[PDB]
């Protein structure tokens, strides 16, 4: 059964991923985006008292300007979450959002809380991924300064694993299509939380879809693209890469016991968590080391998992992962069924729980039992979670 201290997910809600370049969130702050998302998610589950939120753990990378000074609290203050509650912003680069989920869980398990709210935000339109970056010369002494440029780290993993430009563009058109497909069939309605935004002309209106998705993507169009990172002989292009997206994800978590008391069916139950490190140069390979550690803790075999949600950092990196994980042949059958970051974007601070959330829905929709959400991280890291519907 469920032990009183097990980590139960009560709900998951994400904002409609928008284009950073003059998109639907161009006039919306990162904080007001997060504070909002959280407010709405809570309103859906009224049986949970916001006053019980032991701690608001939010994930955010470029913690400067709007995203500076523990944005977790800045958001919690503009919510129905009392001042009595706490708040902390976790940063583990791309995996920030997912580490938050872990941190809270661990808290719930150790008996230092009962109801936490974890999420993540990242407004790349207002805080460019290259804003305020001071390269430390002393890094070149112990590592490669080039290992920083995420695109190149995809290039290397691609070559070492021999991923062709064709293979990549193909996976790209797949993400877009599958994403679009799921959007239409409203497979995203349950997780997407409507939100005020502004169209081209700047007209205020509500969005319930993802601007990022580009259904007009074809091998013929992605072939025209030029290497975005390696000029002379590049494979990774702007088309097989994740999109610069302004977005936020949210989740309500609590012990299994508290969940039992309030009486409400879990969206899933975390069974294991893990993180791992890899060389900065081949950071895209992070998922495999972390996945293994996670499964071993879960006491399962990669074959026991029904659905997978691997964040699509790069095509040249996502593919090798699946391959080495020995699930590439099972892709279209159980991998990123609702599309990935190539079509949904990759809002650093957000992505973490985002895929972890979407993964739960894919399970609730196709009757899954065990799901796996994993993703590579910058500078060489990996993180994955293993949930179970029950």
């Amino acid at each position: 059964s469920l032990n009183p201290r097990d980590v139960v997910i009560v709900d998951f809600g994400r904002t409609p991923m928008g284009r950073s370049k003059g998109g639907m969130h161009r006039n919306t702050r990162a904080e007001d985006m997060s504070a909002h998302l959280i407010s709405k998610v809570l309103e859906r589950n009224s049986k949970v008292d916001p006053g019980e939120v032991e701690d608001v753990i939010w994930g955010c990378v470029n913690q400067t300007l709007e995203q500076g000074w523990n944005i977790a609290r800045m958001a919690s203050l503009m919510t129905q979450i009392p001042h009595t509650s706490a708040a902390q912003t976790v940063s583990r680069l791309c995996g920030s959002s997912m580490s938050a989920l872990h941190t809270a869980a661990q808290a719930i398990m150790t008996g230092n809380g009962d109801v936490f709210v974890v999420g993540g935000v990242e407004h790349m339109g207002h805080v460019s991924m290259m804003h305020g970056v001071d390269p430390n010369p002393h890094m070149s002494l112990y590592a490669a300064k080039a290992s920083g440029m995420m695109g190149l780290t995809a290039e290397m993993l691609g070559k070492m694993h021999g991923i062709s430009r064709e293979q990549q563009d193909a996976f790209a058109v797949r993400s877009h299509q599958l994403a679009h497909k799921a959007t239409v069939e409203g497979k995203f309605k349950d997780e997407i939380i409507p939100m005020q935004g502004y169209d081209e002309n700047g007209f205020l209106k509500i969005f319930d879809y993802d601007e990022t998705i580009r259904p007009d993507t074809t091998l013929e169009s992605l072939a025209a693209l030029k290497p975005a990172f390696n000029p002379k002989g590049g494979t990774v292009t702007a088309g097989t890469s994740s999109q610069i997206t302004d977005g936020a994800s949210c989740m309500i978590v609590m012990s299994a016991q508290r969940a039992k008391d309030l009486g409400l069916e879990p969206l899933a139950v975390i069974r294991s968590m893990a993180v791992a490190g890899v060389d900065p140069a081949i950071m895209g390979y992070g998922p495999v080391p972390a996945t293994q550690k996670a499964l071993k803790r879960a006491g399962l075999n990669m074959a026991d998992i029904d659905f997978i949600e691997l964040n699509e950092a790069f095509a040249a990196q996502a593919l090798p992962v699946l391959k080495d994980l020995k699930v590439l042949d099972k892709m279209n059958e159980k991998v990123n069924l609702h599309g990935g970051a190539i079509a949904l974007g990759h809002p650093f601070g957000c992505s973490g729980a985002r895929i972890s959330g979407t993964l739960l829905n894919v399970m609730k929709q196709n009757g899954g039992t065990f799901g796996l959400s994993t993703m590579c991280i910058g500078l060489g890291q990996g993180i994955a979670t293993v949930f179970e519907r029950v």
Binding site: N27, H83, Q196, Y198, N201, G202, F203, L204, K205, I206
Partner: protein, 239 residues
């Protein structure tokens, strides 16, 4: 047309929506004098009584939206006995408050400058779409007074205490860019596509897409700030 005055004309539009436009005939601007007010009073009563109206829009047929009244009239009014002045402003505010209580989504189409009463009028409506070149402000303190038409009431509940004080105490004019950043205006557009943006928003408000009833509520109830935060925010503002 639903209403036809010398300063205000309530013309009917599509889908039962209606446009209330400020076009003071004979002058070059728009100001809240005895006439303007008395007409807006009638204009509202017409709408409020017309059970066909489903949406209201507030526009201006001049280069500016609505500037301040003739300084001349000010001198006059402030000469009246206290009990009379207050009684005069109470009636004036009711005109706005009533327009604020219309069981119909209202949008202010700020095309140009909107100072004092001009801005206070907009503060009454639910949503607000401003032109990218327009400006809005409450230059009351420059005359030794402060917002009289519910300015010190709506502004704080719309943009926030700290901002409301920063806007009123300075009476500075605020540009479109900073106007949306503090949420004084909901949407910003260009002079040529303003009318479109307004008309569009209304339809969405009517369609139920946007909860106009929930957006108005905030300036009908007490401030959001805590008790500690009030004292904190206020005592510092005073200091």
């Amino acid at each position: 047309m639903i209403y036809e005055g010398k300063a205000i004309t309530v013309t009917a539009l599509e889908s039962g929506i209606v446009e209330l436009k400020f076009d003071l005939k004979g002058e070059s601007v728009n100001k809240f004098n005895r006439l303007t007010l008395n007409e807006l009073r009638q204009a509202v009563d017409a709408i409020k009584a017309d059970a066909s109206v489903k949406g209201v829009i507030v526009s201006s047929g001049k280069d500016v939206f609505i500037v301040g009244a003739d300084i001349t009239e000010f001198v006059e009014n402030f000469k009246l006995p206290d009990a009379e002045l207050i009684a005069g402003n109470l009636e004036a505010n009711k005109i706005f408050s009533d327009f604020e209580d219309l069981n119909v989504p209202t949008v202010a189409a700020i095309n140009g400058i909107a100072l004092g009463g001009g801005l206070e009028m907009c503060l009454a409506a639910d949503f607000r779409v401003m032109a990218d070149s327009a400006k809005i402000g409450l230059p009351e303190v420059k005359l030794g007074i402060y917002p009289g038409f519910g300015g010190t009431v709506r502004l704080p509940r719309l943009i926030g205490v700290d901002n409301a004080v920063e806007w009123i105490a300075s009476g500075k004019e605020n540009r479109a860019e900073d106007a949306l950043k503090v949420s004084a205006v909901d949407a910003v557009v260009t002079a040529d596509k303003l009318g479109a943006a307004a008309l569009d928003l209304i339809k969405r408000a009517i369609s139920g897409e946007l909860d106009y009833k929930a957006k108005r509520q905030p300036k009908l109830e007490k401030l959001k700030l805590n008790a500690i935060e009030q004292m904190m925010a206020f005592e510092t503002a005073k200091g």
